[PDB]
């Protein structure tokens, strides 16, 4: 069976209103799984799309760790927006694809792209890097058609 | 075009070896969208899944917030796993699917499930719910097939 679908057998909600959802809901119980295992004070957020899905917002307290952890996605009917079956699809960094495009031989430095020229990141296995391998790494990145001028330079330690 | 391939005409690297390229990198600069605007001193670390993919781990401090923030998601090779072009998927509490299987007339409490009978939550717009609540919500899931002891109760302020 599809992970978009119901359980086989449960009935859902079918008069659902979305606009009435909206908002701030607390987490009273779950059956854990490795995303949530240790979570506290948990929530979840719900906001309308332009595009007529839901954007929502997961927040939790991890005791162990001592700190806030937050999760961001979106959810689209699979049917009618009277049917309370969604598909749901998590946001992160690395939108829809990752691939290594310039790597050199010691695997210290890494050019990475997404699915289109909008999606592009500088990584290293140290936080800094020379002017050197930063001209390398932009000239790459401009011969493949990059607009290297959209580059955020990240703050990281010295 | 796919989400799932790379940007036109750009060439991936063809000799890669998944083994040495695991473990922490530093985002050196990106290109920016709404997710990691304004984060700082961000990582990714990754590990090697039992099925063959790569886990992930993303770590960045938010400053307008003052917080650390963190993102987990698994990435596939989309063909021979020496050509480094992968297909991301980000992880979450609600995996597949999202399903409103109980609702109250007032929007108040909810029973919401995923794609089998292993995904159960119990949703308030209060932090705390009446025993008379949770002995409904508690009934609904029984006569659906769900197994309720398996409900962690989440703690949630007084
Ligand atoms: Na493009
Ligand atoms: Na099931």
Redesign the interface.
């Known amino acids: 069976?599809?992970?978009?679908?119901?359980?086989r057998?449960?009935?859902?909600?079918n008069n659902?209103?979305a606009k009435?959802?909206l908002?701030?809901?607390?987490?009273?119980?779950?059956?854990?799984?490795?995303?949530?295992r240790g979570?506290?004070?948990?929530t979840?957020t719900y906001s309308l799309r332009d595009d007529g899905g839901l954007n929502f917002i997961?927040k939790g307290y991890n005791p162990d760790r001592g700190?806030?952890?937050?999760?961001?996605?979106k959810?689209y009917f699979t049917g009618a927006p009277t049917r309370?079956?969604?598909?749901?699809?998590?946001?992160?960094?690395?939108?829809?694809?990752?691939?290594?495009?310039?790597?050199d031989r010691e695997?210290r430095h890494?050019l990475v792209?997404?699915?289109?020229?909008?999606?592009?990141?500088?990584?290293?296995?140290?936080?800094?890097?020379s002017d050197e391998v930063?001209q390398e790494m932009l000239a790459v990145a401009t011969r493949?058609?990059?607009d290297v001028s959209?580059?955020?330079?990240?703050?990281?330690?010295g």
Chains 1, 2 share one sequence.
């Open positions: 069976k599809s992970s978009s679908t119901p359980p057998g449960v009935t859902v909600v659902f209103d009435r959802y908002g701030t809901w607390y987490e009273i119980a779950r059956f854990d799984h490795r995303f949530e979570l506290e004070k948990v979840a997961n700190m806030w952890q937050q999760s961001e996605g959810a309370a079956a969604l598909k749901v699809s998590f946001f992160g960094p690395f939108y829809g694809g990752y691939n290594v495009i310039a790597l695997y890494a792209c997404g699915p289109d020229r909008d999606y592009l990141w500088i990584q290293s296995r140290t936080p800094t890097i930063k493949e058609g990059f959209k580059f955020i330079w990240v703050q990281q330690p």
